[PDB]
Each structure stands twice: as structure tokens, then as C-alpha cells.
Curated annotation (Swiss-Prot):
Bilayer topology annotation: Multi-pass membrane protein
Organism: Severe acute respiratory syndrome coronavirus 2
Quaternary structure, from the entry: May form homohexamers. Interacts with N protein.
Annotated ranges, domain Macro: 1-167
Full-protein residues shown: 1025 to 1191 of 7096
Protein name (Swiss-Prot/TrEMBL): Papain-like protease nsp3
Catalytic activity annotation: Thiol-dependent hydrolysis of ester, thioester, amide, peptide and isopeptide bonds formed by the C-terminal Gly of ubiquitin (a 76-residue protein attached to proteins as an intracellular targeting signal)
Residues in the signal sequence: none
Length: 167
């Protein structure tokens, strides 16, 4: 039993809700919240900008130190950093950005990072400003992640489309 409330169950291990991931994280304090990061951990907009803003920019400060030490992530890769006031940990995962021409096949590799964590609160990778089809992203998530994933979808309209078209 865990503290996630109001989710619709899609499969044995994947759950979905219409929610703001910032507010969902603030209330649940999950062990892991996933950020839709870029390789530079520049959290300017989308989910990343919203998560970072909710941390009063502490996420960005920590991220800049991480990059200065380690260099950029790989597309499809991840790193574990602090969850600040939102979660114990933040798993920064880089899905391919279609608006940069990145290979969508890397979306599966991105979701594989979730399997290193028993339970996660996460957005749909490569959705939103990353330009991928959220329905495809959900399919890859379901077919790749084996651990327990609670997906937060900000837009009510897209949420309904994702549920209604789910196979
Ligand atoms: N550009 C942008 N995309 C965001 N996504 C990307 C998205 C996937 C489909 C498009 C999303 F809309 C959704 O799940 O419906 C969330 C958020 C955001 N800005 N600010 C936010 C603040 C939050 F608390 C949570 C999510 C976002």
C-alpha cells in the first residue's frame, strides 16, 4: 500500500491521473519524482521548469554543480539528484526531443531508467514541449517499465484521450 490517490489503473504496474506533477509531488512526497530533463539539466520550461520553480531554483543550482563535475547526460540517460521539497529523490531522465530531431527509438532507453526504482511519480517522457506523441509515449512506458509508475498528466483533455485510446 502506498499514498497515491485517485489514479486509474492501466496495467499490473502502470497507473495514470490528471494532475499537476508539482502539486502531486508536494502532497505525496514520493520517494522518486521523475523530471523530463534535457542533457544539460537546464530546467527552463515544461515539466522541468515547473519542478525547478517549485524548488525555488534549488534544483537548478544542484544541477549546475552536477554538470560542472560530470558533463552532460546522454539522450536516453538519467541521473539521481535530490528531490528537494518535492520528493526524496528526483530522477532526471532525458527522453528524445523531437523538436531537436532526436531518434524516437531512444524513448525506450529513457523509460528503462525507471526500472531502477520500485515506485515512481512521473510525467510522460518526450511529451509536451519535447514534441513526441503522448499516446506513443504511454505505449512505450507500458511496454518497458516493470516497476510501479504513477503518471501525472497535466492536461485534462490529453488525459481523457490517453485513457480512451489505451489498448
Ligand atoms: N510546457 C510544459 N509542459 C508540461 N508538461 C508536458 C506535458 C506532457 C504532455 C504535455 C504535460 F502538459 C502533461 O502531462 O499534460 C506536462 C508542464 C509544464 N509546461 N508545466 C508543468 C507543471 C506541472 F506541475 C506539471 C507539468 C507541466
Amino acid at each position: 500500500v502506498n499514498s497515491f490517490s485517485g489514479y486509474l489503473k492501466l496495467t499490473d504496474n502502470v497507473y495514470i491521473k490528471n494532475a499537476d506533477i508539482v502539486e502531486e509531488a508536494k502532497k505525496v512526497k514520493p520517494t522518486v519524482v521523475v523530471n523530463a530533463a534535457n542533457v544539460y539539466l537546464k530546467h527552463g520550461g515544461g515539466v522541468a521548469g515547473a519542478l525547478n520553480k517549485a524548488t525555488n531554483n534549488a534544483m537548478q543550482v544542484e544541477s549546475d554543480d552536477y554538470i560542472a563535475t560530470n558533463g552532460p547526460l546522454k539522450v536516453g540517460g538519467s541521473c539521481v539528484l535530490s528531490g528537494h521539497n518535492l520528493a526524496k529523490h528526483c530522477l532526471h531522465v532525458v527522453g528524445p526531443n523531437v523538436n531537436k530531431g532526436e531518434d524516437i527509438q531512444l524513448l525506450k532507453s529513457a523509460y528503462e531508467n525507471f526500472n531502477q526504482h520500485e515506485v515512481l511519480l512521473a510525467p510522460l517522457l518526450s511529451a509536451g514541449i519535447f514534441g513526441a506523441d503522448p499516446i506513443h509515449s504511454l505505449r512505450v512506458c507500458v511496454d518497458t517499465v516493470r516497476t510501479n509508475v504513477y503518471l501525472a498528466v497535466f492536461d485534462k483533455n490529453l488525459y481523457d484521450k490517453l485513457v480512451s485510446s489505451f489498448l
